[PDB]
Amino acid sequence: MQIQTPDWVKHAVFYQIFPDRFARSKQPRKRLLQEARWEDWDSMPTLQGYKGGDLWGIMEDLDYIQNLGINAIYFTPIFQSASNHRYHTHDYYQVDPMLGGNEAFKELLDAAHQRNIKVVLDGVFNHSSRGFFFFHDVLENGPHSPWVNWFKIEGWPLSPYNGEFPANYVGWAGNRALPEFNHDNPEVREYIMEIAEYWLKFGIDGWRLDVPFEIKTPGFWQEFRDRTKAINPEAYIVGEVWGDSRQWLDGTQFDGVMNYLFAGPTIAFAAGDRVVLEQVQSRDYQPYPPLFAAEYATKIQEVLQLYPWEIQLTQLNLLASHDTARLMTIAGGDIASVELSTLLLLTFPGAPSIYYGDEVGLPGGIDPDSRRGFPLEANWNQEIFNTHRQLITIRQTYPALRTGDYQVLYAQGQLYLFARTLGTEELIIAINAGTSSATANVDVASLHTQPNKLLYGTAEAEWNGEEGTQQLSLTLPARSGCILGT
Amino acid sequence: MQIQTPDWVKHAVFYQIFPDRFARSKQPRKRLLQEARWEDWDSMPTLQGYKGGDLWGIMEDLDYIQNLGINAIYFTPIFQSASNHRYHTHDYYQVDPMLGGNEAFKELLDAAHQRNIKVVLDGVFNHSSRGFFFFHDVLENGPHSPWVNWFKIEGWPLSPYNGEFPANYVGWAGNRALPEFNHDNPEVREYIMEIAEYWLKFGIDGWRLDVPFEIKTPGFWQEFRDRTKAINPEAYIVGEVWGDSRQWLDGTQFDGVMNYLFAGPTIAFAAGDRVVLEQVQSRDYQPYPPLFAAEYATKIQEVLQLYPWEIQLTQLNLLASHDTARLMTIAGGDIASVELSTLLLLTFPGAPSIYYGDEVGLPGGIDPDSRRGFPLEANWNQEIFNTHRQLITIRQTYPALRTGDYQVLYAQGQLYLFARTLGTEELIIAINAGTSSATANVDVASLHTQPNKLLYGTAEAEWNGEEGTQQLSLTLPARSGCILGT
Prior knowledge:
The structure is a homodimer.
Chain A: E1 14-17, H1 19-22, H2 45-48, H3 55-60, H4 62-68, E2 72-75, E3 79-81, E4 89-95, H5 104-113, E5 118-123, H6 133-141, H7 186-202, E6 206-209, H8 220-231, E7 236-239, E8 256-257, H9 260-270, H10 293-304, H11 309-312, E9 316-317, H12 327-330, H13 335-345, E10 351-355, H14 382-397, H15 400-403, E11 405-412, E12 415-422, E13 425-432, E14 438-443, E15 453-455, E16 471-476, E17 480-485
Parallel strand pairs in A: 1-2, 1-10, 2-5, 5-6, 6-7, 7-8, 9-10
Antiparallel strand pairs in A: 3-4, 11-12, 12-13, 13-17, 14-16, 15-17
GO biological process, one term (chains A, B): carbohydrate metabolic process
EC number (chains A, B): 3.2.1.54
Keywords (chains A, B): Glycosidase, Hydrolase
């Protein structure tokens, strides 16, 4: 049948958050031991003064979030794991008892929902942790464990914690702290499908699929989509696949991916040489080498004619992630690069994703730590913030920028002009990557109207001419962008 | 204030069960993956044909149980742990997902309760397991784990699984699979108190405290009793303390103990030389050397004048346990020893405890495995069964045998006579350990009545004489016992 994808995804702006570093709620909070005397409280140091952020924090700062204009939050992993290994799941059926509750998370959901803000969670199903119950059993019962056929065991004896031995079991990427599941095993596919159903029933609006391309068992993700959509047909299934994702985007598996194929070129064009190159997560995307308008267009037109349009409309566009360096940093502090990128990001077909912190001045190293991931402390970057908040209002104002088509009008030198059009609403977006005020004459025979009014980026160039096969000429300051409408 | 103890304990007969080996319910049972296609079921071997018993089984066999006359069941550990290390807790907040549910256990409770059969659970709070979440964290985060002060860590680096290293953390009895908690730590006392409250709220009728004498933090068990009694004032708190338990039986901690002080002498007298001595858990009790009536009496009178009577009435009397060899076995197959013991056990002040299997022929080694712990297969020992079922009806029939006083009338040679009296109801119990029909003349000036009618054990000796300071003479066959009433 027709390929379908959640229609709310198609009009959402996403905000990716890292719970442990985003926000910490006000003091009155029973952290690990709920049923605890407030008189004995100080007796327990861990709970007395806990630093890192929690789910109360996020919930306590929904005002901010909803004010930026974002209407769907999706985190990293928040399920119980090692204090600082969120990705080494210990228990999938419990939100971690430091940063969060199964009681806390519940309040965050409810809260979010009464504001029409969806919430997607990160599912890590390719591998768990040494602590994960069934693996634990194996470690404790060696050859006799009932679920030895649940993992990838080479031989015995295993050596889970001792480095200078073989552990005879496959990790994620040859790691012994990330025991890989044996997805071929029916029992396993089942246990996983249930975790997905459990949280959907709990009330989440979708799953973020982590390294989903590792799970190669045939028929897996189709089932994942059936059992999921069955519980909530409006659930969002996003895969965190790096490159070409056509394998999963045929309409019977994921609704979309985190579109790094869009992140690479956009930054390569908008920042060019300015890209630090040291913060480049070369694994995830290729923001390099620098691109010219003509090249950017070819690459984007390619990316665009890659997936069924229904899915392109529910693709998660981005420029940063927990896995990558922050935007402000990858551009070496170049505010221009930061405003030009976003502009493309918020005017591209699909769901735009904003990594918490980027809507303000906040930098972010690639390497482990980081950091700093409390947005607010202010001393914000008000301008880049206003750029973010302004562009988001606009995108939510003109439907074309969400589900209109994408047509390249001009793309020469360092100047790029495309058009988003839905119905009789046509918009012209122009980016001037160059350092010299640029100007271009374009034969706009495609359009049926004449976008004359500056939404956003303050052109001086415009002139716009007759209606016999119309005739346009733009002039934008160096390193500027703009949106033309009306 | 007055010392109080649950009054239902005072009139209950207990049945200790080992869930994994007791009973396995009928096929239709969604074992680990509830939400699983019955059409894919056979695809998952583990669930397809699981051997060991579950909580459905027990629930499915309540008829049997309630028919024996027992009215309160208390298990070993049933919380999630290694497939075969029930005592190495992995998660206290979940019944183990093989033998049991948090869904299954719920049905067992409800079921039990609608029959007025209480259910006590075994709490293992001195130590958990490598898998236990917070310990896991430590293992994963070494010196940086947030809860390093939750356990007994000597130094770094720890070596949880590698034998031929120091693991620098205290185990239970120098074991590295039983990480000991740091009970001095307030945070820990809290987490534990909550587990106790959680299950009480869930619906259990008491806790069996495992190796509670290891937890030496002052004020601990008093708090445990307050927080517990607070949620249910009729909750039963039993400590599995081996010997002299006066430290905990002052009325502000436990309601009782598993009275091994009663198990030792009783068997030492009732079986004598017949005690195998190879199955002797010499750690738990001393069923040895053999005792004469005069010695048994001195020891029992001692045991009896050891604890406040209110508590003696809520002591858990027994002759076997998961930790020990079964009754039939410890007596080397001597059925006499088995009938004489029970007789003393079911006529002693306090709650009698029957280890599943003993109410029938079933033997049981001391060593690890066992076994066999499905009672039924029949081929029962009908007689010893009828002895059990008969003695239980009687004990429930005459209140004196539950809360009456204990007075020794005669105790010479291998003949022993005591009297349970409550109100105007007086009972005479006589045990003839010897191998030669014995007879004794006793000056019964204590009694106010004249038990002339044979309840149970078929005396020939009786004669009973006048009421001027009355005058009794019994004659019992060798290795026999009897109960005199009316």
